[PDB]
């Protein structure tokens, strides 16, 4: 039966992309699909071949970031969960995250304007389901007010959910007066503005969650999960003529430290064809680094990764997930809280190596690339992950699971 | 009374400033981490603030904790408790102080130029209160006292006003103050909470010291109230703003540029006071900085002095303190007998 | 089971669009989908959220059209099939079409370069299925040479197939020496260039054909048809804030004669809210025409048509199909061979009125708009068409039918 | 011999020109619709071409059918059978004549300056051919004749060359000509087909007329061959090109600008010939235009004259004609006895 599905993302090209194949999945099923977001995300929605419903007005980040926000970029790079230290699990630390990230990021996106914009569209268009990016709190609010079923669609790890579950876990130890919950206080006084229902953790996590990540690398949250076979989307993809041919020698593709990018010479000491995702602009200073190295700029990963014996990347979801589904061993170079956590999970499983960028050494990379290419274990690990993922339903099949869940 | 729309806008502002205060604070700067008041012990931050002397924060603000420079600015007339200038980070954050802080900064600015009865005639009424303390005795003292020169619950809701001027409170907490906030009466509400924690901290300090305990009963003293307001002042921080550019130790302080005097730090300088972090009732060191026009400080010292003398007879659970009070550091629960 | 599907269109934005929802249907099913076309169509492929494989080089139409082709635009506007005259079914006439359209259009697109480009990609990428726009003969050639199963995906009527079936139908009456077949001669000598199989009508029509048009308005060709529930794609769609609300009074939307566009006053005498798809530029001369009329520029038809009691349009597939699936009665203003034929079929069924633009009168339009709004028959007709279309499988379901057909 | 790649490129070119010829033709212009030769009867197009006199087509070309202007240009020396200029539509179409037409236009240009035996000594060999015609008699006449002054099948493959110069043939048909095309011998191959259809049209015209039938047997005539080449010339169209700008009835004809003389139209002008579309063996009107250097026309008239005289004894199915021959209008099947 025919449905009206709303997809909502915050105005980030980096975030919308994780919803794109499932939006198209619904519309191919014959359902009405609209991507409700802020005017900024409109070009990116239309470039995904999707219908945009731009609601509300844009937010001046440029001014906020130049004067206030920049320090919060310096604050975030500090936090590290991949090791589970007791120091990071203190009430003082956890409430810290909740106090800073709630206004400076979650609520900075999801502004005054967007939430009333979505609540207006939902009241009018009368959707049957709302699928949202995990940090666009406007959508569950709109869905709560309208009484519309809603579900989250994850890309990387659900680190915010784990951080929150821990924060709430400490609330009872603290005295009644010392208790606080910025995200709940915000969403509660927001739900009141539209006369909506009482606050429920259901507005923070969804009614269910869809994760394209294999069961074993997912964090334990207890939330209703619908696993999904990952299908890549990463904006405008154009296949170059050179990527038509089956490779000659074995291939390692390098995608984007403190190594002065002169690290290309380190991966050059590896016995393989290297495909570097760097433009002629990005490698204007490199003069002796190329030998077995090929520089081809930004190319489709879903077309390149099927031809690689191994991969070296920043740890981004697109790179992680695409390599994972193709059973391609990984050498992750993380710099974010979200990337480190996942890089650690994938190394524990044996589908690769996690090389934190602050600690990173050119010797480590040469050894790590040599390790994934020669040890049949990393491939075997990567083979299990791939097999887990291909056993999950395709976005096509997930449409029926949502359809059913949406009913009850 | 206020719409759920402007409420939403206000809440967002209070949450943004606190978010940025914590971010800036966790990143390094001790003044905004103090402003969050997530800790109950601020004495290490005060050592670091005194050690530096004068330093301007991540926000525009000048932090004066050195007793030498603290007295220097408190005595200078250019530095006043008026509406200064909006720093770029705040307006860029979308939270002008003129909006989230406004009622509360007018309270700080208020002066009570009225006769202050220090008669101790007050201690007569205050006698029959403790049977054979935060709300049952301490908060009872200013109400009955100001009545014999302002409703109980009304003053209790506004009690956060002098913290709210520098540190954003919760939305309901900020909401309840504005609705219960009345000039002189406004300034009297402020003094009521100033007196209230003074009574708690004094009875708490007397309770530990062996002398002060049975000694207060011998001569019902003003010396204990004096020493208590040194280790635990009415206002730990003192928001001021320059009208004309001032030179303080090689530093140019611009017009409308905010300066915050860290009174609690200043009042424990090792070079100015002997055994500063130690409670000494009989100490020659009376060069303690406090509070600017008016006699509100003189009013509270009297209400607290009368109070300490009345409870001299009784003097020989876990203490919970208000968690968003970097200015006045209030107690919420003080058990028991 | 996982497939490698190639979609091929000629370098026309007007033609690619009809393949877009089925390409996305396959990829949501977890299959590898690549749109192989000439470098010109690349921006449009990426704007559909699809992966482009640009093969070969572009064709200079601007030069060809300015000096040779323009007359062929004048030649095409002459041909008219909607009435089935005996004069148009003469051998002389039919061979005429075959002699002019084969080089000047079919083979003008599908150039030297594209065909070798596709044959190269298919030999290398090894697709499992090739779905093509009905007039991109490079794709069936590539599919023939590679031995890959291939199918056509129609949008409007299969008028070329009907014209060809008639042409071949007369070939036997003509003497052995007077026989000719330009399209076969071209495809035969093309198949020889790649050493491919012998010529088969299977290279002209597909191995099967997918048509989003209801069974009753389809031409009788006898070809293996897979009906499909239509899902609109028409490039970048952005919903305006005004289209969120349920309309007040009944709505007729007008989309693009010899009436000097002063015809707006004729539809203005109709008792309804008129939504004109004209920009402020297109209506710079109109000064008294608006009264109940609203000018809103290009808007999403799949978002506007669900709110209309009736529709007035040029007869284009996007407008036809979208209105048809929404049971919206139509007043078609045709100017093309493809549009007239279909406009006639839909009028015969009673789902609307066909008003040829050469014969068009402002009195005809006012009467026709009044007729669809007041006679419950046009709605009832449009209701049957809609019901036929919703009984056909969604592009989601068609993926399995192709999957199965591709095997045998 | 030639690669399947250049073959593909050639085929595409031949198909584009014909496509544009038909398009232009169907749209109005009669010269390219004639060039397609989809009809077997061209006489109405010739009336329209004569009616106009001179008109330049959709292609650059000047169409001269008025007998007055037709003779005017055929006699003028500037107008020659050489390589002219490429019109913009053709190079824009991607089919320069220098490519799809080239061998064939050199054939038209070829001159046979050799002794022409008109002896009629030829009619001696030609006698024992028809037992008690396109390939069994007509095409047999030039081969055995030129042998007694060039292989049968070779000449038959090249027979389309003088049509191919203006009208694109099929790819296999164009392919077979180029491979069978040899100067004088090249020009002789051309004359062989010129002679071949002359024999067919003559025997066809004799067959209908009551006189000509039993009359040809009485005196074996050159008069019939003359009249036949008026109603059915060797070349109906005559491709010429200007070397220097020429003025023809108020029209400026540029250098390298193509002119095509419509000889078959011209040879049936109502003002020049009495009962023009009627076969009259004994007619005073001998002002018929034909063919430029050489004696090839003189050679064919002799081969055809000898042929008609030899078959004078036999003279007292459906006729199929070549469908892409607007220049020479050949027959492919001529049944029977």
Numbering used by the authors:
A (entry chain A), C (entry chain A): 19 to 274, 285 to 436
B (entry chain B), D (entry chain B): 20 to 151, 158 to 174, 180 to 212, 215 to 252, 255 to 325, 330 to 354, 360 to 380
Q: How is this structure described in the published paper?
A:
For example, the in vitro activity of the GT EryCIII, which produces erythromycin D (3) using TDP-d-desosamine (2) and 3-α-mycarosylerythronolide B (MycEB) (1) as substrates, was enhanced by the addition of its auxiliary protein EryCII. We report here the purification from recombinant Escherichia coli of a stable tetrameric complex of EryCIII and EryCII and the solution of the crystal structure of this complex, providing to our knowledge the first structure for any macrolide biosynthetic GT. The auxiliary protein shows significant sequence similarity to cytochrome P450 but lacks the essential cysteine residue that coordinates the heme iron. All of these belong to the GT-B structural superfamily of GTs, consisting of two domains, each adopting a Rossmann-like α/β fold, in which the N-terminal domain contains the acceptor binding site and the C-terminal domain encompasses the nucleotide disphospho-sugar (NDP-sugar) binding site, and catalysis occurs at the interface between them.
